Design a protein around this ligand. Structure first.
Ligand SMILES: NCc1cccc(C2CCN(C(=O)c3ccc(C#Cc4ccccc4F)o3)CC2)c1
Ligand SMILES: NCc1cccc(C2CCN(C(=O)c3ccc(C#Cc4ccccc4F)o3)CC2)c1
Ligand SMILES: NCc1cccc(C2CCN(C(=O)c3ccc(C#Cc4ccccc4F)o3)CC2)c1
Ligand SMILES: NCc1cccc(C2CCN(C(=O)c3ccc(C#Cc4ccccc4F)o3)CC2)c1
Lengths: 242, 242, 242, 242
């Protein structure tokens, strides 16, 4: 997370940490609890290559990474079949926990948006995670969960920004319809926030608008953060999630 | 270049080295002389972002990188407008030298293939460059130009190979029609060879079949080297090159 | 700490962490509370060059580094005047805290040994710290305080061990009288443990026998851990510490 | 080498490169040809630990490192028996080549100084090598042999300089009698120059005053380059070299 601050303990109960086996269970991506037994994440965190289920653990909301770990095994990794790169799209995946979680006030699910949902240019949206604090700048220990309010940038506006200082023809779509933009040069998601949530408050309800996917660097001029647009994958999510 | 050997001094007269300004004019990509004033390379070497022309130099065929440098300025960088990532495709670019080169026996152009040329399996093809000798293994000093004979793999066989050990749906094309596959677990191109040529001997004539583009690592099981298919961009090349 | 385990919360109340100002107050050396207002450490942690007092903080006993920091400023850094490198010796320093600490059961001083105490082989001795778990292997997050029981080696034997597989003449003393040896190929102190304590239980009292100083790597054959022998510097320590 | 320039082809015929076996025969230290079958170097380049003779090669004068390698095996590594660290001293070693070299105008021996030879300030002295061009700044390819004219500083003035901004007592000798100082903030030897020569022109004859040994960084204020004083080891050199 670029800019913003350490999240209050009561905020973002759906935030999860994805862990890889090694010298320690290291954080590699974020995610969100969307059902007591399901985690929503980015496909690029777990693919396109198939990896061993035993080498993965899920960690529920934690104020400080690694401090009070209670690691959860995964029974299934479901990666969107259209996925191979974040720039092509379909950067979405589902993790089925071996067991459902005991939902509380401090740890509970995020609401997915309705199929119609549009996120207008400049809505109140927040991105959260334990990712880098800037380009090649790690989140320092004790690794607090960070948050940052990010402005929505309309797809066409965002796509035109990606063409500034680039050779790509104006007629060539970089920001696809299954993608969403948010952030600026002071507020953004970064490496390590991938797979984590972009939540917008709509009519007093927090809705997950996006999944942290890609971009050119973090908080770079004319390069807003690119998110997987959740509404585009609602049917695919609902085929697996009750 | 993974496998193969140091190229004889009389071989590959069209091979060029792309140099970036810094503590020294460092090699970052390969290229090929296709006309006395034109270099063919990969778009990912010079894009998608526009960089300063002054920060780039072209070095003609050199036995050992850096030892007998005679650097050449560039007046134009022409990147295919469809390009943004090597995985999407259109990974091709043209560099116009400020001045034409004095063509000789040791330094001369490569022949582009006719539109009809397919390059089927069994064809004798060679990849050249000063790139990595294996994954995260730099070409050691004195940096000799290397070559490796690589087997051609049918696009469909290659696409199926890229689906092995991956979540990507079989109906999702990874290796596109504008791409070409070459290499195996002992013979391949690697980081630093990008932009360079894949040449095939057809009826006693060396034809540039491909441009080193991408792949998953270097000489990895079920991951052949992926090349930009030159024949697909002949009309675009001919719009700029006489 | 090589080998051993995470220390119980009730053990080693005198253990301190030395912190350097940067992106975060990073651990760089250990130390020990020898008086409510004095920290004993290694001179190589703070010298031979004079550094800014404002760039240093002391952290009292912490179960997990960085997680519950209450940083303490220093008013004086007193480095043994004989010191320039750990291999020559006099690798000892004193830090005067700006304020005395409120001593409790969980955080209190270690006892210095009497001048007569030699610590022969067979003495139960423990070395503690947040240093590397092996050669070029950092202590993983959440960074627990580790301990390891180490066997003492009599000086002349340790000096002769340092000559094995080395060109240094047998008559040339490597391990000096102001030094103490402890550890083997499974149990040792390592980078980041420097300045921290080696404590031995003598007549039901924990005495600080040494200060983690140097060695050739960590737990390497014929290279035991070298400590500054506390008894040798008692007069110098008493010139500053009540 | 910090400052100075690329050496002319006719200069420093005695300069050698020490090579270690790995992905390539990599330069790790310099040396000097003092006899057709003997190389003078620093003990720290080859010790204090004993390494395999097969893992070492000597490369004679080369304008550009790695370009025209003709590596030479070594039959004996003789390290001064007083050596363990460069800060203590006796940082000198001898390499006996398996075969003598065919001496020419481009490749020949350096003259050792007479025992009476003091090299006072004002004497024209050069240090040569393929080492770093500054602190953490590698010599760029094609790796030319560099030279730098360095001012001699008297030992007591140099000793006092090493005490500036350090805790070490003024009565504690850092720069020993078996050492020699040269260089300033614009001229110095650096990592990779170690073992190489410091030569002074005395009565039309080039004499090797020193062996690159140590210092605190490269071209740092109040930290001149420290050399092993050759005159101090003439008897030891003469035990082995005719
Ligand atoms: N700040 C949002 C965000 C969140 C998580 C991870 C990242 C990564 C994604 C990959 N990274 C890249 O630099 C990267 C990979 C591909 C591209 C291009 C691009 C681009 C730029 C101009 C025009 C067209 C393009 F495709 O950028 C590192 C940052 C970025
Ligand atoms: N061996 C030929 C070659 C020549 C030059 C440069 C490379 C690079 C290209 C980028 N690299 C990658 O590892 C890379 C970037 C994107 C992918 C995927 C993939 C993939 C795997 C299974 C299914 C679908 C995929 F897109 O791999 C490093 C090697 C490779
Ligand atoms: N296990 C003890 C320990 C505790 C804290 C920090 C270290 C460092 C000290 C410096 N290191 C070295 O490898 C080092 C620095 C100098 C020497 C030599 C030596 C030597 C070997 C044979 C004979 C004489 C010697 F002085 O080794 C890395 C670990 C080692
Ligand atoms: N003069 C340039 C030069 C040439 C060859 C090799 C080096 C090395 C020697 C080791 N290095 C150090 O930084 C180093 C190692 C030990 C010391 C201290 C010291 C010191 C400083 C003040 C007082 C007393 C000291 F012993 O410095 C890096 C470069 C430096």
């Amino acid at each position: 997370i670029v800019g913003g601050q350490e999240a209050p303990r009561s905020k973002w109960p759906w935030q999860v940490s994805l862990r890889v086996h090694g010298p320690y269970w290291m954080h590699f991506c974020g995610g969100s609890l969307i059902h007591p037994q399901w985690v929503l994440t980015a496909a690029h965190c777990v693919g396109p290559d198939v990896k061993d289920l035993a080498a993965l653990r899920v960690q529920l909301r934690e104020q400080h990474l690694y401090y009070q770990d209670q690691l959860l095994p995964v029974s299934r990794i479901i990666v969107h079949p259209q996925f191979y790169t974040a720039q092509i799209g379909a950067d979405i995946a589902l993790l089925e926990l071996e067991e459902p979680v005991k939902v509380s006030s401090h740890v509970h699910t995020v609401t997915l948006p309705p199929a119609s949902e549009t996120f207008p240019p400049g809505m109140p949206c927040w991105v959260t995670g334990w990712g880098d604090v800037d380009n090649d700048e790690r989140l320092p220990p004790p690794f607090p969960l960070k948050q940052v309010k990010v402005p929505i940038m309309e797809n066409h506006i965002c796509d035109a920004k990606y063409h500034l200082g680039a050779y790509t023809g104006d007629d060539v779509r970089i920001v696809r319809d299954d993608m969403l933009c948010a952030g600026n040069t002071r507020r953004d998601s970064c490496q390590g926030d991938s797979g984590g949530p972009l939540v917008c408050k709509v009519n007093g309800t927090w809705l997950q608008a996006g999944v942290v996917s890609w971009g050119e660097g973090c908080a770079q001029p004319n390069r807003p953060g690119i998110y997987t647009r959740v509404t585009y994958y609602l049917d695919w999510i609902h085929h697996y999630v009750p």
